Amino acid sequence: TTALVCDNGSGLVKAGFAGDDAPRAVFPSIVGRDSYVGDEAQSKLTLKYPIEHGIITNWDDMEKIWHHTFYNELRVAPEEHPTLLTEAPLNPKANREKMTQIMFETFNVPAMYVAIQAVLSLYASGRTTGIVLDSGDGVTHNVPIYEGYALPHAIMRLDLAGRDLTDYLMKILTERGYSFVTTAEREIVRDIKEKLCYVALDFENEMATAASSSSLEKSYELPDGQVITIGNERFRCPETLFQPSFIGMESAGIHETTYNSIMKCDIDIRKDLYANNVMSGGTTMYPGIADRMQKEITALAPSTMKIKIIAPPERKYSVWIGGSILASLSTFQQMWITKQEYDEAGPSIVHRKCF
Amino acid sequence: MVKVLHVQGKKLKEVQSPYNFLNGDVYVIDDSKKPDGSDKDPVDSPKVYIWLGSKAYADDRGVGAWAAKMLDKENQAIDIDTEVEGKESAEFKTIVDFSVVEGDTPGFLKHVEVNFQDVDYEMYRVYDTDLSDGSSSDDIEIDPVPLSKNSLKSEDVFVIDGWNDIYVWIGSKSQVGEKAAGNRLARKLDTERKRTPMVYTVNEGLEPNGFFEFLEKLEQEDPKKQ
Numbered sequence: 077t078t079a080l081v082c083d084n085g086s087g088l089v090k091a092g093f094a095g096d097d098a099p100r101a102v103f104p105s106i107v108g109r110d111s112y113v114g115d116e117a118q119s120k121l122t123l124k125y126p127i128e129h130g131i132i133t134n135w136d137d138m139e140k141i142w143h144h145t146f147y148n149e150l151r152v153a154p155e156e157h158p159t160l161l162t163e164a165p166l167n168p169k170a171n172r173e174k175m176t177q178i179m180f181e182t183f184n185v186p187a188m189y190v191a192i193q194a195v196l197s198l199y200a201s202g203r204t205t206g207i208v209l210d211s212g213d214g215v216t217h218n219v220p221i222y223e224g225y226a227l228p229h230a231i232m233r234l235d236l237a238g239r240d241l242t243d244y245l246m247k248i249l250t251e252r253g254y255s256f257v258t259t260a261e262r263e264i265v266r267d268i269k270e271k272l273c274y275v276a277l278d279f280e281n282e283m284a285t286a287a288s289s290s291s292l293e294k295s296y297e298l299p300d301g302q303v304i305t306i307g308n309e310r311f312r313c314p315e316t317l318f319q320p321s322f323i324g325m326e327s328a329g330i331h332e333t334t335y336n337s338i339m340k341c342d343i344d345i346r347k348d349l350y351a352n353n354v355m356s357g358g359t360t361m362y363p364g365i366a367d368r369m370q371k372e373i374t375a376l377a378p379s380t381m382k383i384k385i386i387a388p389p390e391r392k393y394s395v396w397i398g399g400s401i402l403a404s405l406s407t408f409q410q411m412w413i414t415k416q417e418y419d420e421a422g423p424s425i426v427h428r429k430c431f
Numbered sequence: 432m433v434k435v436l437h438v439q440g441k442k443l444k445e446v447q448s449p450y451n452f453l454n455g456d457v458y459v460i461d462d463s464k465k466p467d468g469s470d471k472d473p474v475d476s477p478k479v480y481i482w483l484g485s486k487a488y489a490d491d492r493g494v495g496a497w498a499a500k501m502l503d504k505e506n507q508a509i510d511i512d513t514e515v516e517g518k519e520s521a522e523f524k525t526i527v528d529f530s531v532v533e534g535d536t537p538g539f540l541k542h543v544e545v546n547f548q549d550v551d552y553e554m555y556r557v558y559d560t561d562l563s564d565g566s567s568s569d570d571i572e573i574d575p576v577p578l579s580k581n582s583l584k585s586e587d588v589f590v591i592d593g594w595n596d597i598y599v600w601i602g603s604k605s606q607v608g609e610k611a612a613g614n615r616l617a618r619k620l621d622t623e624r625k626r627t628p629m630v631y632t633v634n635e636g637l638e639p640n641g642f643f644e645f646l647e648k649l650e651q652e653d654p655k656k657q
């Protein structure tokens with residue numbers, strides 16, 4: 077029987093079957109309240125995000141997401157499927173327990189496992205040691221990993237990701253005299269961001285280029301036929317990841333959190349981390365980000381240090397794809413919590429079996 | 432003395448000399464056990480290497496990395512290293528003699544039809560393969576060709592897909608059916624992308640000022656060279 081893989085994000089649910097090369101269900105992690113989930117809620121209520129900055133904070137709404145995933149999207153009977161779930165770095169112990177209790181007591185799954193998202197990405201890249209930069213819709217993490225285990229004392233978190241870049245692009249386009257209010261319009265700005273934005277290798281040089289010619293300008297045709305043009309907006313928007321002061325956040329950019337994370341780790345593994353930076357998550361998809369990160373880390377690191385940024389082309393779904401691969405291997409499923417073990421031990425079993 | 436394992440789908444299969452690593456595949460080199468088959472003394476630094484072919488996809492990589500974790504799980508003194516095709520460490524290069532050959536065992540993941548919708552660039556040649564039959568519209572083929580001024584040929588039509596900008600380049604010696612098919616391909620790509628792209632049809636020798644600079648950047652910047 078085929079295991080299920082559900083990768084629950086702040087912004088999007090990614091769900092499907094172990095053994096597929098991509099999730100078959102991708103939909104917004106939204107609930108509107110008696111229940112509208114996903115695109116059905118974002119067109120119809122008060123909408124709540126059950127997952128905030130990667131951690132589940134609304135358990136009634138999360139149950140409903142999982143319900144919608146099982147019965148409406150995947151159309152499966154959850155009692156017939158072992159289920160791999162993912163969790164954020166630094167997930168509180170009580171959260172993993174509640175996740176385990178809901179899977180067994182509400183949905184009656186035969187077996188389950190909870191994996192750290194970044195760890196699934198690192199395996200998908202062919203590594204057991206390395207440091208993942210995971211940047212999605214709600215949160216960005218640096219997660220150093222040594223032989224398959226995240227090093228929790230060295231994890232760094234930045235509460236800035238794709239939704240904030242979308243909001244910033246919406247702000248600056250609105251100041252230029254465009255307006256985005258409709259469902260369409262907020263989704264139009266996100267589409268502009270994903271199609272036209274990129275990370276400058278040198279921000280000051282790119283600003284100068286944009287000030288002195290039109291060579292960086294791009295047009296975008298709206299659904300009515302009207303055309304939008306943007307120039308330095310294309311790279312100012314994701315520049316926020318390296319300078320969070322662009323949106324009024326006093327905090328380190330992702331190159332500094334990478335370096336800081338590496339520096340919290342044992343000096344003995346640092347050379348391995350520098351050479352094994354793996355990017356994952358939709359917000360790492362910008363053209364130029366890998367090269368910019370390489371340049372920024374090189375400036376921070378010792379001059380002898382070998383630096384490498386691994387940015388697989390499928391990395392927007394690396395977490396889910398890692399889950400789908402591992403949930404397919406017998407040796408991995410032997411590690412899962414069985415319905416019998418849960419009844420015999422309760423939700424606290426998750427700490428012994430899943431790390 | 433070392434044991435070398437080839438990822439084949441969700442399997443690990445042992446191979447013997449001569450070692451010819453396929454560049455689309457992943458090998459696990461087990462240097463953790465003494466001659467008889469017993470775990471090596473931690474003093475003797477038991478190691479497991481995961482060799483990643485440059486063209487290997489995530490399933491081959493994940494199966495190989497999980498297999499090394501399983502060897503480490505049974506003997507934690509093991510140190511795991513990942514080696515990348517063409518940049519192997521001097522030490523790994525000391526313990527296995529191997530060459531690298533062109534070739535790819537497909538991974539075990541089943542293909543699902545989902546568009547990742549991420550910035551990707553491509554150049555297509557649009558050509559009718561038999562003009563002796565009096566039609567340039569009935570034998571049209573669309574082939575990807577390298578993104579480069581070098582691929583442009585006067586005799587055919589080329590569609591340059593720069594994701595948000597799409598160019599239809601008309602060779603000065605190309606045929607009418609190739610122009611129709613070229614424009615139809617651009618229209619299909621524009622339609623798939625909710626019409627947000629800008630689409631231009633340009634003639635050979637009359638290219639807009641930005642055109643050849645744009646073709647160079649697409650080749651340099653193409654996030655998925657294939």
Ligand SMILES: Nc1ncnc2c1ncn2[C@@H]1O[C@H](COP(=O)(O)OP(=O)(O)OP(=O)(O)O)[C@@H](O)[C@H]1O
Nearest residue numbers: 085086087088212213214215238270357358359361
């Ligand atoms: N090609 C792209 N370029 C830029 N941003 C993108 C691209 N594709 C997706 N995104 C952004 O990535 C975000 C979704 O990414 P992801 O699924 O990794 O996040 P998530 O798991 O929901 O969030 P989190 O990890 O923060 O809880 C959205 O903000 C989306 O706009």
Ligand SMILES: [Ca+2]
Nearest residue numbers: 085086193212
């Ligand atoms: Ca995520």
Ligand SMILES: [Ca+2]
Nearest residue numbers: 455456535536
């Ligand atoms: Ca292969």
Ligand SMILES: [Ca+2]
Nearest residue numbers: 507508509510
């Ligand atoms: Ca070990």
Ligand SMILES: [Ca+2]
Nearest residue numbers: 348510511512
């Ligand atoms: Ca090592």
Ligand SMILES: [Ca+2]
Nearest residue numbers: 561562566570
């Ligand atoms: Ca013909």
Ligand SMILES: [Ca+2]
Nearest residue numbers: 561564569570
């Ligand atoms: Ca014919």
Ligand SMILES: [Ca+2]
Nearest residue numbers: 558586587605
């Ligand atoms: Ca021709």
Ligand SMILES: [Ca+2]
Nearest residue numbers: 297626627628
């Ligand atoms: Ca268009």
Ligand SMILES: [Ca+2]
Nearest residue numbers: 552653655656
């Ligand atoms: Ca390409």
